[PDB]
Symmetry: C3
Subunit: 287 residues, 3 copies
Amino acid sequence: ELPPVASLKGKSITSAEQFSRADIYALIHLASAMQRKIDAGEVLNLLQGRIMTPLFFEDSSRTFSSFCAAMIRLGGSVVNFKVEASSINKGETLADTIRTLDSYSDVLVMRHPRQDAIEEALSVAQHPILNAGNGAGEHPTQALLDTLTIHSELGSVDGITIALIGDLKMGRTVHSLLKLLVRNFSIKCVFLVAQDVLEPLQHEIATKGVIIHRTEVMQKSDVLYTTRITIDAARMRLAKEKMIVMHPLPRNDELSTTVDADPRAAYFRQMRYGMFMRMAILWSVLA
Amino acid sequence: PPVASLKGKSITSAEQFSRADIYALIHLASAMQRKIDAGEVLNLLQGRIMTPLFFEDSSRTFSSFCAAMIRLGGSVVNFKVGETLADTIRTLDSYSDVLVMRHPRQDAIEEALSVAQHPILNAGNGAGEHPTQALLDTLTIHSELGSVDGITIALIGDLKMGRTVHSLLKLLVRNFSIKCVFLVAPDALQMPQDVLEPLQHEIATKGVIIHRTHALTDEVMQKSDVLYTTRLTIDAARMRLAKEKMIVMHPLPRNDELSTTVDADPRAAYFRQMRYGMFMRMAILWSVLA
Amino acid sequence: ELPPVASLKGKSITSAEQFSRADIYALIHLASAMQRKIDAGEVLNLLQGRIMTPLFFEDSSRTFSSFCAAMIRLGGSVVNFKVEASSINKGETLADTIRTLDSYSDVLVMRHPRQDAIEEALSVAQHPILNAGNGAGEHPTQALLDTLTIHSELGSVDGITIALIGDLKMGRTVHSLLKLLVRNFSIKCVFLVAPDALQMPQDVLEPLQHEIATKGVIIHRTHALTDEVMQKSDVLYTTRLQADITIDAARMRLAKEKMIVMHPLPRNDELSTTVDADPRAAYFRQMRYGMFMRMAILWSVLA
């Protein structure tokens, strides 16, 4: 019914590159099985007596709350550790902070801007660590929920035309999304609406025959993915019938509130797919 | 049994409740009290999530709502408060079963309602209302005094900005036959007209007596079944004027207006009032999410 | 199983002085039994429906988190009151705050930088309060879990030689630990390692004087970690400044084979990371013992 993904058991998750196609599909179907059960109004006790602790050294609305609700809806609990009210103010090191939370918890959810910080944490923690985002563009559960969103709303990820839109120079998190999409699925076409990112993919781009075009988008795209070239109701008049608009959030003026009523606006539903994908992930790690 | 009338509703105003609704809530609160005090566990809302969305500070309101959800077997996702209020609401709405919102602007409850898919419980909208505070106040009166109709109540303090007294006056005038209401306040902090005017017809019809005073007269002390003071003096000296069968209430927090000298008086119901509050909110939350 | 320690039923915990040796061993053994159950994977429901509210007016990592984790693993719940986001900002007194959380809660866990704030709290609270640290006064539950650590790691507390190291003046953990050990056990020798400015206060040492004399406990002050201290001590218990008293790998060459290094934590440079791979390094394991001791305590208070 809710079979854990075996390959993730006990694994720390820090990068989307750690997943095969087969993991990605298994997580998608597990998250869908989670949605069915939860929207039926039924309880899960799968992680009763298990603790997640968040270590957020940066702010998060979405990701922090999503992670907590996921754990709770699996029947688990959350220790509300706050970095700003911690013994870090008395000089405690990052390594000592990890060992501390590791003495009480079953899983840690870490958000820290620096990649070598999550790495130092991995070298001292006995329990799994899940990366909730860093400045290197590693946000693996965002990449997976985005992919679940496309799959669920359109029926499939293979075959799609997708526009990536916004800060695609310094937006390291979408560079990861592209890589997951390109390595695991058969994308028809990418638009980059605005070197080191596309080069590692050139092979699969050629092998799989993925058409690329930097910048017409409105008419051809199955997915308009934007980040904080404005999308509004007027521009949506040119979009196709079966398509979606996505945004990891938060947004500024690049995505008008005039889109919010459009049934193709998928960026609020996107957050709820996030809860279910994170349920799929937590259960799989801790089963 | 959950109060059916509240099922899946948001709670924004004292005005939405019938007399039957209130008593149903009360009888439900009192059953919950008895089971909690007998050590009975209630697993009524397992796997439901409340998110408190507090843009102003709170000790009671925040904590009672969290405590009430927990005592119903429910859970709480804490959320620390650049992005719009509507976008924030949708975010919390994407994982919660119920939102508890307190916000300094009066009309923000209404804006949140306009984008929220799940029920929102108004926990203070500016100078407007505090609905669940009025329900728990009335539960306090019923439990401590044994009846609500026929009481003489003094509402003391800042009646102008006090959301609690706005809601409490509204709840008692519409659904009960109170005998007398003292409004005890200096002219500039008196109960506004936008609260009193709409109640005029009910006051007239039920023969409610309304007296305004600028200070806590001996008459007020000597005739009230309930002294409900609010923040911006009652002390043990003044409590010597109180009747034997009566209570002192205050929604809290207090400063000087309610002295610590009163605290040990059997009639000081304002601490028990917080606990009635927890049981009332259990009744509310269960009713909404049944 | 896991019968509660009856003597703690309904009791606030303010001081290491309030316990008997029987209470101490019962708590230690209960915590060990909790550890076996949790590590076997059992899901406890002993405190289903019960609430702890943390009330921390100072920073914390271990004490806050272990108490929350202890309550959870007992099947209990936590209300996350934040002092910074509270009605204390609108004029509310400590006493009214206590009465507020007391109206909803089964147990309060209180840390406050004022030494007598805990007495004020107890004066108005109907429900139990556990002292998680009162200024430079005490940290009673730390002393309990430290003693569980010693017992579990060494197998005995009577007859040990223990060095208390660092800032003994302001160190609330060593205040509680010294009182707990001296009153209830037959300690052979206590080394008090600290420069004169930071030595163990007389308001701790003087009350224990009779007991030390009757039990023949040897008390020896030093300024540094001398060869003697290193060679004789079964426990090295070191603290942070709230002197050559630093423990590192090279200093550990003088340590005996059967001994442990402890630190209540957080640490600064007084306890080098070069010690961390040493099997005698017990200060991480000490945190996990702390969670199990707080489970023993919370259960015994609330059963």
